[PDB]
Amino acid sequence: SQVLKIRRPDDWHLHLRDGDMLKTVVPYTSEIYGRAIVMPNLAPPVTTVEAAVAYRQRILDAVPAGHDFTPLMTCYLTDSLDPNELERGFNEGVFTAAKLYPANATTNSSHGVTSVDAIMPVLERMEKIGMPLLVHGEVTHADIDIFDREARFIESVMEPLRQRLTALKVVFEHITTKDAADYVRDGNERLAATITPQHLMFNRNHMLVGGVRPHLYCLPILKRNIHQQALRELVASGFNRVFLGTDSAPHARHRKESSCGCAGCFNAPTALGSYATVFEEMNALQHFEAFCSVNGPQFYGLPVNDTFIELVREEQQVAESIALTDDTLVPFLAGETVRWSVK
Amino acid sequence: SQVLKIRRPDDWHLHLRDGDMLKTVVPYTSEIYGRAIVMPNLAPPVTTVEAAVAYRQRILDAVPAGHDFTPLMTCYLTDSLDPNELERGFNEGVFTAAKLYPANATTNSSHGVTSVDAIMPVLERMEKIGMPLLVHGEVTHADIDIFDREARFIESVMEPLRQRLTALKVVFEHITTKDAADYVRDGNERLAATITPQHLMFNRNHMLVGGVRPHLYCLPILKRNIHQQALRELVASGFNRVFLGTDSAPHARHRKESSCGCAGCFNAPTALGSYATVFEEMNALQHFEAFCSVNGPQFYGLPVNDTFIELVREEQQVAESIALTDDTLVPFLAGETVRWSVK
Ligand SMILES: O=C1NC(C(=O)O)=C[C@H](C(=O)O)N1
Ligand SMILES: O=C1NC(C(=O)O)=C[C@H](C(=O)O)N1
Ligand SMILES: [Zn+2]
Ligand SMILES: [Zn+2]
Ligand SMILES: [Zn+2]
Ligand SMILES: [Zn+2]
């Protein structure tokens, strides 16, 4: 019976893939979100204006008629990236931001950045022209326990970087730890963060107790419950430099369910309702709209969307699977009941 | 190429399953080990002398001709277990030991234990007759992080138990933490432990960095590197109350590589050479035989084997899979080149 009307949201961290997967997954986004930050970790990665322009058209070709959706493109940073290519892309309205992937931190990140020092001229230009930096904040050294890679990145990479480039605007993407939650809560106006639905709904126990569940396996890895509780307290607080970023990251079923499952939750279909449930459970629905629809635009210096959507507290069942030309796609919370759905 | 001759080993912690799976996996054990402790967790569990006698025979039926293999049977401890039934099985040489799986208040009295306190009559009887207790040492409360479940057991159950029943001999099965390594090391002649090959060879990064690997998913869960190092140090020390227990725990490929993967490594085919590799790496081959062939029999009060086997340091490839009647079995280290092989 409970209806919840909000300003149309945006997704400030999205993986749309390419080809047949792209066709399949964009509508789950374009039917709800006004804009999306579309990450550049294709194979090969989007590291040029030309690439990004063509990719943006592939995205628009796949948007159903009558969806008013704008994909906001990113540059995949690399050690050798020409800062003139990054700036040109920004000035032509192609690149909204640039994305820092530490080499081998996640999917399609082997071409990622090997150090901050290797890309200083690029970072200094971003700082100059006011282009925000999106960070996948994990270290990747083989000796560092997977669950420590986020916290380690803060002391060793993030904090020194922000001390060097005091005017650089940085989004700490998909934060998963109390460490990151306090770092952002205590940061200045040039530091923001996104949080996915899964890192709010679940902790590592959900992925590993009673069976291993690859459909909850994603990066950065789900942490212990005290971390999850931090993140939930952060969004519930009303802190206005956190915003919605799904990190929807789809993989075919048998790439998830194999002897080496790919990391990624396909949560585009079910994310907004999942966020609503978290905010509802935290007695913080008065902060929901801002998380979804205002905080991101404010950080990015963009206008808020001028249309509205409704969520209804009526229990929908999530589909077991979504067809692809080859294999299926298992949505996040496949087969599950959800408390809130879009009207 | 280098040869390691040892007295014929034994496996002090093994799962053989039943029916067709038993028929397939027995030979991997019976060709190498003289004896194995056969765990009782069938469906339904082995909780009677009658059941254990029939199970033993099904095992024996499946032992290839010429193999000198003796299965050592165990009783699954339950709330409803009659202490006279357990004592009769022990007296008759049917039950070598009794196995305690984690308590759970919602468990049917026919299938498990609600609390240790509720099975004191049985624990006091084992203590009286000198019957060893094998302990899966995890507390399974929903609110306890999975990586903490072993350490919490020590504090909450193991120590209080051993302080109550001071003559009870206890094997702390498949230890995975420094917490347990230290505990066992600082214990008395009545406390011992087994360690698996996977818990020596790997830590949780191997299961979760660069993909999720369900074939490394088993209980208790792989822990962070410091724990793996504590276990390696313990076996390498020559400490003589630790011994070989594979915890070989097979599941068909489709049950491992699903949306909810079963816990358990099928390591019977490769465990021995994997332990040899570990002792070599620790510069401790002088303690290899004792671990495999001496320590367990001493603790259990059984004769050391009088026949010998030989491992050779010749590189061999592990099969990618093993045929079942209806699926396949993916072995531990499938498709990998291993260092030590039986001659
Ligand atoms: O698990 C994932 N998978 C992917 C992907 O692109 O497959 C991206 C994110 C991320 O770390 O940003 N997490
Ligand atoms: O991962 C596993 N799976 C099983 C099993 O019986 O499936 C047993 C062991 C254990 O904890 O004893 N570990
Ligand atoms: Zn990322
Ligand atoms: Zn991402
Ligand atoms: Zn066990
Ligand atoms: Zn076991």
Side-chain angles (χ1 to χ4, degrees), chain A residues 262-341:
Chain A
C262 305
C265 304
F266 186 44
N267 63 23
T270 51
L272 188 62
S274 297
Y275 287 122
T277 289
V278 168
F279 278 84
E280 188 192 1
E281 288 173 336
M282 300 299 289
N283 315 304
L285 285 165
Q286 83 268 26
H287 298 309
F288 182 57
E289 178 172 268
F291 180 83
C292 299
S293 319
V294 181
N295 296 345
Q298 186 191 41
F299 190 75
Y300 278 84
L302 297 162
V304 303
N305 289 323
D306 66 1
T307 57
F308 298 84
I309 70 171
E310 280 168 312
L311 285 153
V312 193
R313 202 171 184 281
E314 283 174 349
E315 286 176 330
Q316 254 192 35
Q317 263 228 359
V318 179
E320 277 292 357
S321 79
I322 300 168
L324 307 161
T325 342
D326 328 270
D327 207 356
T328 65
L329 184 42
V330 168
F332 180 64
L333 310 163
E336 231 88 75
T337 317
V338 285
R339 192 193 284 176
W340 287 94
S341 45

Side-chain angles (χ1 to χ4, degrees), chain A residues 56-112:
Chain A
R56 171 168 69 184
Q57 194 52 71
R58 290 200 294 285
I59 291 162
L60 293 172
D61 298 344
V63 167
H67 293 191
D68 181 351
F69 169 72
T70 312
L72 304 169
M73 315 305 292
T74 53
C75 196
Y76 188 105
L77 286 181
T78 61
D79 280 14
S80 47
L81 183 58
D82 188 350
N84 291 337
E85 185 85 20
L86 226 214
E87 176 168 358
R88 192 181 107 239
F90 186 76
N91 289 343
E92 295 180 13
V94 177
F95 296 136
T96 294
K99 176 63 170 305
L100 174 44
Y101 293 104
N104 300 305
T106 193
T107 308
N108 288 344
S109 70
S110 75
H111 301 278

Side-chain angles (χ1 to χ4, degrees), chain A residues 31-332:
Chain A
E31 78 185 310
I32 303 306
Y33 298 87
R35 301 155 293 191
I37 295 293
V38 178
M39 293 302 181
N41 68 333
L42 303 184
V46 179
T47 64
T48 58
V49 178
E50 186 180 43
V53 166
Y55 182 35
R56 171 168 69 184
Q57 194 52 71
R58 290 200 294 285
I59 291 162
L60 293 172
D61 298 344
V63 167
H67 293 191
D68 181 351
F69 169 72
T70 312
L72 304 169
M73 315 305 292
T74 53
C75 196
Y76 188 105
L77 286 181
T78 61
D79 280 14
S80 47
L81 183 58
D82 188 350
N84 291 337
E85 185 85 20
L86 226 214
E87 176 168 358
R88 192 181 107 239
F90 186 76
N91 289 343
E92 295 180 13
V94 177
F95 296 136
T96 294
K99 176 63 170 305
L100 174 44
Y101 293 104
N104 300 305
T106 193
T107 308
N108 288 344
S109 70
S110 75
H111 301 278
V113 172
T114 64
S115 67
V116 165
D117 307 339
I119 62 162
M120 270 299 169
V122 171
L123 293 176
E124 283 171 0
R125 186 67 66 74
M126 291 179 83
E127 181 185 42
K128 251 283 176 158
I129 76 193
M131 177 174 206
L133 180 68
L134 318 187
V135 182
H136 180 114
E138 293 189 285
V139 302
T140 67
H141 194 289
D143 280 357
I144 293 167
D145 187 83
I146 190 164
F147 295 96
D148 295 344
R149 293 179 175 195
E150 185 164 306
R152 295 292 282 279
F153 182 94
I154 295 160
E155 41 148 337
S156 70
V157 185
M158 192 63 103
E159 176 61 6
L161 177 62
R162 294 178 66 258
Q163 294 299 334
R164 258 224 59 159
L165 299 102
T166 47
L168 187 63
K169 295 170 289 180
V170 176
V171 191
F172 200 161
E173 295 301 338
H174 48 48
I175 59 165
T176 62
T177 62
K178 173 168 197 292
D179 305 79
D182 297 338
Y183 184 77
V184 173
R185 193 207 45 243
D186 298 339
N188 72 12
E189 37 137 273
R190 290 148 293 201
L191 177 64
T194 57
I195 304 181
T196 74
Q198 66 264 25
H199 289 111
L200 293 162
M201 330 199 65
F202 296 129
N203 64 78
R204 59 196 192 176
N205 268 32
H206 293 101
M207 185 179 55
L208 300 170
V209 175
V212 58
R213 303 181 177 82
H215 299 298
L216 302 199
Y217 174 69
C218 68
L219 303 170
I221 203 130
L222 283 163
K223 309 294 196 288
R224 147 201 301 287
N225 176 242
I226 62 193
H227 293 294
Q228 180 200 7
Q229 298 310 116
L231 299 170
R232 296 166 71 86
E233 301 166 33
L234 185 62
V235 302
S237 69
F239 179 69
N240 70 348
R241 293 192 307 280
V242 290
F243 41 90
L244 193 160
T246 61
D247 200 22
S248 192
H251 298 276
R253 175 181 171 202
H254 289 100
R255 304 262 288 135
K256 291 293 304 192
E257 302 183 4
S258 68
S259 68
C260 191
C262 305
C265 304
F266 186 44
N267 63 23
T270 51
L272 188 62
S274 297
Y275 287 122
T277 289
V278 168
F279 278 84
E280 188 192 1
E281 288 173 336
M282 300 299 289
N283 315 304
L285 285 165
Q286 83 268 26
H287 298 309
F288 182 57
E289 178 172 268
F291 180 83
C292 299
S293 319
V294 181
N295 296 345
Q298 186 191 41
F299 190 75
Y300 278 84
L302 297 162
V304 303
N305 289 323
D306 66 1
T307 57
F308 298 84
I309 70 171
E310 280 168 312
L311 285 153
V312 193
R313 202 171 184 281
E314 283 174 349
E315 286 176 330
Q316 254 192 35
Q317 263 228 359
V318 179
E320 277 292 357
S321 79
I322 300 168
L324 307 161
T325 342
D326 328 270
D327 207 356
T328 65
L329 184 42
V330 168
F332 180 64

Side-chain angles (χ1 to χ4, degrees), chain B residues 176-204:
Chain B
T176 66
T177 62
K178 186 183 187 298
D179 300 74
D182 286 343
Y183 187 78
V184 169
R185 191 193 66 208
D186 297 342
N188 67 26
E189 331 75 47
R190 298 168 187 293
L191 175 63
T194 58
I195 305 180
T196 65
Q198 60 273 14
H199 292 108
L200 290 164
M201 293 191 57
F202 307 115
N203 71 68
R204 58 194 195 180

Side-chain angles (χ1 to χ4, degrees), chain B residues 13 15 17 41 99 101 136 174 218-220 247 249 251 263-264:
Chain B
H13 189 135
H15 302 273
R17 310 301 196 201
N41 61 339
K99 179 59 164 314
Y101 286 101
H136 180 123
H174 49 47
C218 64
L219 303 188
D247 202 22
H251 296 276

